[PDB]
């Protein structure tokens, strides 16, 4: 449905080569930072479940959690931006290809238009 049947879509490809034209997600993206925060929370919860010291034990394990979450989140954000860019590109192309379906509308100043007044009495 929707983008699934786009022509030229290679199946089972996470990031098409077209996506490289888009800017990469900045490593300081707030979304990537939030992904790292999720990884850190996962580390804390793992420590709590295994009854380890919550904030001090398994620093290597917490580091692996944060690294994995950030690493996957980077590609996740890149694909998200790619899909949104694809949507915008298709929308603009369709708008250009069907001018009648999206006609330019005459713009009028409010003085020209008439909007009825409903007094708050």
């Amino acid at each position: 449905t929707m983008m699934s049947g786009r022509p030229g879509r290679v199946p089972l490809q996470f990031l098409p080569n077209e996506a490289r034209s888009l800017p990469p997600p900045k490593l300081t993206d707030p979304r990537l930072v939030y992904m790292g925060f999720l990884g850190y929370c996962s580390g804390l919860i793992d420590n709590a479940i295994r009854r380890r010291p919550v904030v001090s034990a398994g620093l290597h394990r917490q580091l692996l959690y944060v690294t994995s979450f950030v690493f996957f989140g980077y590609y996740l954000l890149k694909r998200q931006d790619y899909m949104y860019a694809l949507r915008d590109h298709d929308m603009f192309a369709y708008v250009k290809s069907h001018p009648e379906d999206f006609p330019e509308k005459d713009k009028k100043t409010y003085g020209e238009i008439l909007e009825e007044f409903h007094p708050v009495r």
């Binding site: 990469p24 490593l27 290597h60 394990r61 580091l63 692996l64 690294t67 994995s68 950030v70 690493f71 980077y74």
Partner: peptide, 17 residues
């Protein structure tokens, strides 16, 4: 193993970026 995997992950991410 954990430290190595984490470091490799970070280095790969930086190079990819």
């Amino acid at each position: 193993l954990t430290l190595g995997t984490s470091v490799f992950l970070w280095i790969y991410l930086i190079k990819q970026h």
